Design a protein around this ligand. Structure first.
Ligand SMILES: N=C(N)SCCc1cnc[nH]1
Lengths: 57, 225, 231, 276, 338
């Protein structure tokens, strides 16, 4: 009964614990470089001219 | 008009869609809604039958009034994740079986089914969403209860009981115990009816409770009462 | 899915007539409807238009004041009643559907048509009248206008229709760029402002017919002269 | 001396009548969910009281003060408008009381019903036309009776039968109807049902406040005018109490926004949304 | 021996935690301290779409960022044009209890689901000129929380029975079943490359699933309450989770650890929806206090609020080109902000 569930949980833990991981600093640098690499085409950050956006009042 | 012919036709189509939507809303805003919440799935089917997947909708008509009854007994999911969908329902119909006072719910050593019914009634009645909706109690299976109570006195369910073992002053005790779980008597009322297997006036009782609730809500909205 | 039109025949001049158009296989109530004329030896010509729900009705100046259009929604029927007919009304009549919403394709389906015998506007010119060309080679058909068909919202209103001999007109490209559904990808359309061109990369035996350029910027819906593709 | 403070108080009352009814109108027009054949009556009441404040008081203020801007061509119009607006305000309370009576007597028919905009427009137009037809034509006919001296008052104050008939027509029938509707509502709720006693007491107080206010605001002027009309030739020299009774009826048109639409619990949502 | 298996699981999770602790080098704030803050953000309400009569429970932008579908308790599914106010379509549903909706990437199909345990797929482009039911996918037992199209023939659904499914629309039969969650699954989102997807459940944890293999890849935890919303970063290497304890959290797939948490003392109510903006610099999160906060992804500080709804905000979305945002609330009013 519960023995099968426990065995499945142990197998899942074993197959998930072997994943290789990198340092948090590298991931933070990647997210940074992405954010400041695409800041030009983000209308919500830099407001576009009122004569270019399609939505108007 | 600075609009092309196609834009004008699209505007006309949108206006027609608006008209259809408002007509449908006006038609559907004049219907009574009853959420049928049971306790252990005891007697729900019989009460549904006498009033003619995951949710069952029952539509019927009585005295030029349209009633829609929603049954959610088959969800068996976490009630707190979708109960707010039923906020604004006209009434909540609660079904309680009187017969399982002696019976003990399975997988538990000593945990009475009436205790489950009381716990669920307490949870639903004092919910933060149903602070104004009215509860219609339905104590059913009262006959074989009447023969069973003669064999065993009504003391297993409630140790703090002292009275005659007869039907009188015993079912009323359980009804009073259920009605005492309410904590918002100022803004909520509970209706109770003992229903037999061959009873017919249950629909009439529901109609009377619904019209009383409608009158009271209408007068409370205006600032009176 | 189909439109059947009844009426026509011979009419004594000065009389009256009623033509009926019955639809089957689609939601008739949500489609605007058009009556379109075609002279026995000339090109197509717009006649009348009725919206969905009969909200707006438009007539051509040639028939305004004597013609009447009507629709029957509980049934699926369209009526055109003509009075004081003259010798210029003898022609073929077509009953066309058109739906209007963002991304819709008006003039998608055309009826069979019925024959009747009796005994400013945006002008568009089609200098082409006959283009003899062997199958297998690309061909181009040009159509000019007299006013900017482009609109302030970026939309352009130019439709292309094909009429094979002994058949009914078929929509090919709407808004000069969007290919209609159910046609081969050989056809293409291009242009800007005044002059436009339709290009066929590979001709086949089924591409022989007459091509019409029609404008939907504003009523009346003027048609082109039409050009033929001989072999 | 006294004229300055009298003008100040009159202007303050007029400005309050401006504010309450303007608030009610704006709250009605901003929201689109108040279309339940019952807020239109509140709209009519607000319109009537708003025009009262706009027209009746600002024109009357110079007359009673040292200023003499009176005229024969303007006084008839002022009287007709004032009586129209007051009678329309009276006849709109009866409409709301009848609506509540219908709501309580038969809720099933009151719920599953589609009257439409045409019925509401017809009811409003009928109310206004009846309010005019009660008194305005009589003022127009009787204007010829007065000749110089006293003016800008109805010409039928000399006659007692006309005053009795009119006072009956727009005071006795409306008050009887409102009293009957309120007592029917209270009796129905009492027979239908410690908490109940408190609810019944609150309902009785709420129902009695409206009727008492209406009676105390409309009886004194009518009855006191009727008893004064018995004096032959010119009436008895008007004291302060006659002017107090005159101003009480206008003062009634100030608490109407406070009573009927302010407590509807759906105009309160409109007020909260507007102010926040 | 069950106890031996439990001890083994405890040892494995302890060593996983130790490895995760050893993998951490520096905090996200320690690296982002030098970044220039975006400053206060002031948005305006360009459009106000009205016509619904009950609470709006879901919405989803089109692939062209011009059309959008919305679902409410009325039993209606309204397809709006956004540049204009016109209603392109209004589809009546067979069940009035709808809690999710999706719009196909090709624009030819729409999806809906709710308490009826059935996912309805509607076809928009047809010869008859009216929208008709194309498919009724059934097989889930618990209520349907979210649905997301992959292509015209495959969909992914999550139900309240702690289960996710990959449905083939043509045959209608389930293809792959994802199980392992303890609590009810509330939301999911697909990766930009459409190869993996994250699912957040009611057991205060999230999981990463591979659609091809069908097996769970990674699991993330740290929230103390229910998780209501989840969404990938535009890069696809991180995702944000909104929970019921008034906290948002950013998790990284490669680092396998949370990076930053967004919380404030003035907010106590839970979070209904979370969505990144273009380039992933901003993070718009709806709240139960009728407002919508705009947090910074690199800065934990706030950057603006959106207050135009009289009731709880139940859904929000950002266009593909990042030109405008849309919010739907329990008040029957959709709003477009820019
Ligand atoms: N007779 C009626 N119902 S209106 C009385 C007009 C009025 C007199 N003073 C203030 N208002």
């Amino acid at each position: 009964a519960s023995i099968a569930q426990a065995r499945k949980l142990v197998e899942q833990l074993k197959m998930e614990a072997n994943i290789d991981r990198i340092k948090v600093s590298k991931a933070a640098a990647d997210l940074m470089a992405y954010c400041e690499a695409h800041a030009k085409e983000d209308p919500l950050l830099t407001p576009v001219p009122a004569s270019e956006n399609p939505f108007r009042e | 008009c600075t609009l092309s012919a196609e834009d004008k036709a699209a505007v006309e189509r949108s206006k027609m869609i608006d008209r259809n939507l408002r007509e449908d809303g006006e038609k559907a805003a004049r219907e009574v809604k009853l959420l049928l919440l049971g306790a252990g799935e005891s007697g729900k089917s019989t009460i549904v039958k006498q009033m003619k997947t995951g949710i069952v909708e029952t539509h019927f008509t009585f005295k030029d009034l349209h009633f829609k009854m929603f049954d959610v007994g088959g969800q068996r999911s976490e009630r707190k994740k979708w109960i707010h969908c039923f906020e604004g329902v006209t009434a909540i119909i609660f079904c309680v079986a009187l017969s399982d006072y002696d019976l003990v719910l399975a997988e538990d050593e000593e945990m009475n089914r009436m205790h489950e019914s009381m716990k669920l009634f307490d949870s639903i009645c004092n919910n933060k969403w149903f602070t104004d909706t009215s509860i219609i109690l339905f104590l059913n299976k009262k006959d074989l209860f009447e023969e069973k109570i003669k064999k065993s006195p009504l003391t297993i369910c409630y140790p703090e009981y002292a009275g005659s073992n007869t039907y009188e002053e015993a079912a009323a005790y359980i009804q009073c115990q259920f009605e005492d779980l309410n904590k918002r008597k100022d803004t909520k009322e509970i209706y109770t009816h003992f229903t037999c297997a061959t009873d017919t006036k249950n629909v009439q009782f529901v109609f009377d409770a619904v019209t009383d609730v409608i009158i009271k809500n209408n007068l409370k909205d205006c600032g009176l009462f | 899915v189909q439109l059947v039109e009844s009426g026509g025949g011979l009419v004594q001049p000065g009389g009256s007539r009623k033509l009926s158009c019955s639809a089957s296989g689609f939601a008739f109530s949500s489609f605007g409807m058009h009556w379109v004329r075609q002279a026995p030896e000339k090109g197509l010509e717009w006649v009348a238009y009725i919206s969905s729900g009969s909200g707006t009705i438009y007539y051509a100046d040639t028939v305004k004041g004597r013609f009447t259009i009507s629709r029957d929604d509980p049934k699926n029927t369209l009526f055109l009643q003509m009075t004081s007919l003259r010798s210029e009304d003898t022609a073929m009549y077509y009953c066309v559907r058109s739906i209007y919403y963002y991304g819709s394709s008006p003039f998608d389906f055309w009826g069979q048509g019925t024959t009747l015998t009796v005994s400013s506007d945006i002008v568009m010119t089609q200098a082409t009248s006959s283009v003899p060309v062997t199958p297998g080679e690309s061909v181009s058909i040009s159509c000019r206008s007299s006013k900017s068909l482009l609109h302030s919202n970026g939309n352009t209103y130019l439709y292309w229709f094909l009429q094979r001999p002994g058949q009914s007109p078929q929509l090919l490209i709407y808004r000069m760029s969007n290919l209609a559904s159910g046609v081969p990808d050989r056809f293409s359309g291009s242009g800007s402002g005044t002059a436009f061109t339709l290009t066929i990369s590979r001709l086949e035996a089924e591409d022989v017919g007459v091509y019409y350029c029609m404008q939907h910027l504003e009523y009346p819906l003027t048609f082109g002269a039409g050009t033929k593709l001989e072999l | 001396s006294t004229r300055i403070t009298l003008a100040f108080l009159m202007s303050l009352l007029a400005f309050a009548i401006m504010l309450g009814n303007a608030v009610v109108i704006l709250a009605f027009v901003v929201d689109k969910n108040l279309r339940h054949r019952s807020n239109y009556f509140f709209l009519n009441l607000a319109i009537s009281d708003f025009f009262v404040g706009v027209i009746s008081i600002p024109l009357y203020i110079p007359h009673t003060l040292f200023e003499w801007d009176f005229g024969k061509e303007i006084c008839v119009f002022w009287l007709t408008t004032d009586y129209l607006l007051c009678t329309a305000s009276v006849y709109n309370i009866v409409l709301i009381s009848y609506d509540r009576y219908q709501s309580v007597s038969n809720a099933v028919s009151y719920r599953t019903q589609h009257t439409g905009i045409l019925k509401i427009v017809t009811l409003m137009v009928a109310v206004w036309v009846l309010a005019f037809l009660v008194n305005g034509p009589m003022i127009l006919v009787s204007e010829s009776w007065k000749d110089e001296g006293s003016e800008c008052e109805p010409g039928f104050f000399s006659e007692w039968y006309i005053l009795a008939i009119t006072s009956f027509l727009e005071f006795l029938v409306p008050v009887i109807l409102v009293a009957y509707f309120n007592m029917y509502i209270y009796w129905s709720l009492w027979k239908r049902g410690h908490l109940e006693l408190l609810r019944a007491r609150k309902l009785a107080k709420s129902l009695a406040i409206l009727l008492g206010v209406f009676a105390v605001c409309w009886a004194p002027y009518s009855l006191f005018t009727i008893v004064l009309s018995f004096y032959p030739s010119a009436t008895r020299p008007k004291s302060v109490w006659y002017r107090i009774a005159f101003w009480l009826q206008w003062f009634n048109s100030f608490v109407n926004p406070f009573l009927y639409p302010l407590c509807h619990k759906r105009f309160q949502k409109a007020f909260l949304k507007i102010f926040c | 021996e069950l106890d031996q298996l439990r001890q083994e699981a405890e040892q494995l999770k302890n060593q996983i935690r130790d490895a995760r602790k050893a993998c951490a080098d520096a905090t996200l704030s320690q690296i982002t301290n030098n970044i220039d803050p975006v400053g206060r953000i002031q948005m305006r309400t360009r459009r106000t779409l009205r016509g619904h009569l009950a609470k709006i429970y879901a919405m989803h932008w089109g692939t062209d960022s011009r059309l959008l579908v919305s679902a409410s308790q009325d039993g209606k599914l309204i397809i709006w044009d956004s540049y204009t106010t016109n209603k392109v379509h209004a589809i009546p549903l067979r069940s009035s209890w709808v809690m999710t909706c999706a719009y196909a990437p090709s624009g030819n199909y729409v999806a809906c689901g709710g308490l009826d345990n059935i996912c309805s797929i509607y076809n928009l482009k047809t010869r008859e000129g009216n929208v008709r039911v194309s498919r009724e996918l059934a097989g889930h037992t618990g209520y349907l929380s979210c649905c997301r199209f992959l292509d015209d023939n495959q969909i992914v659904t999550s139900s309240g029975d702690t289960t996710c499914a990959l449905w083939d629309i043509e045959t209608g039969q389930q293809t792959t079943t994802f199980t392992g969650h303890t609590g009810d699954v509330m939301s999911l989102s697909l990766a930009p490359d459409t190869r993996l997807f994250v699912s957040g459940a009611c057991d205060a944890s999230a999981k990463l699933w591979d659609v091809r293999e069908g097996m769970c890849r990674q699991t993330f935890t740290g929230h103390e309450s229910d998780i209501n919303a989840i969404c990938f970063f535009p890069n696809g290497n991180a995702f944000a989770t909104g929970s019921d304890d008034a906290t948002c959290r950013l998790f990284d797939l490669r680092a396998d650890q949370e990076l930053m948490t967004y919380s404030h003392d003035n907010i106590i109510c839970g979070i209904t929806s979370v969505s990144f903006s273009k380039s992933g610099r901003l993070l718009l999160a709806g709240y139960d206090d009728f407002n919508c906060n705009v947090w910074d992804a690199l800065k934990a500080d706030r950057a603006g609020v959106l207050a135009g709804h009289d009731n709880r905000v139940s859904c929000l979305g950002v266009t593909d080109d990042g030109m405008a945002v849309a919010t739907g609330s329990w008040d029957s009013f959709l709003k477009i902000w820019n």
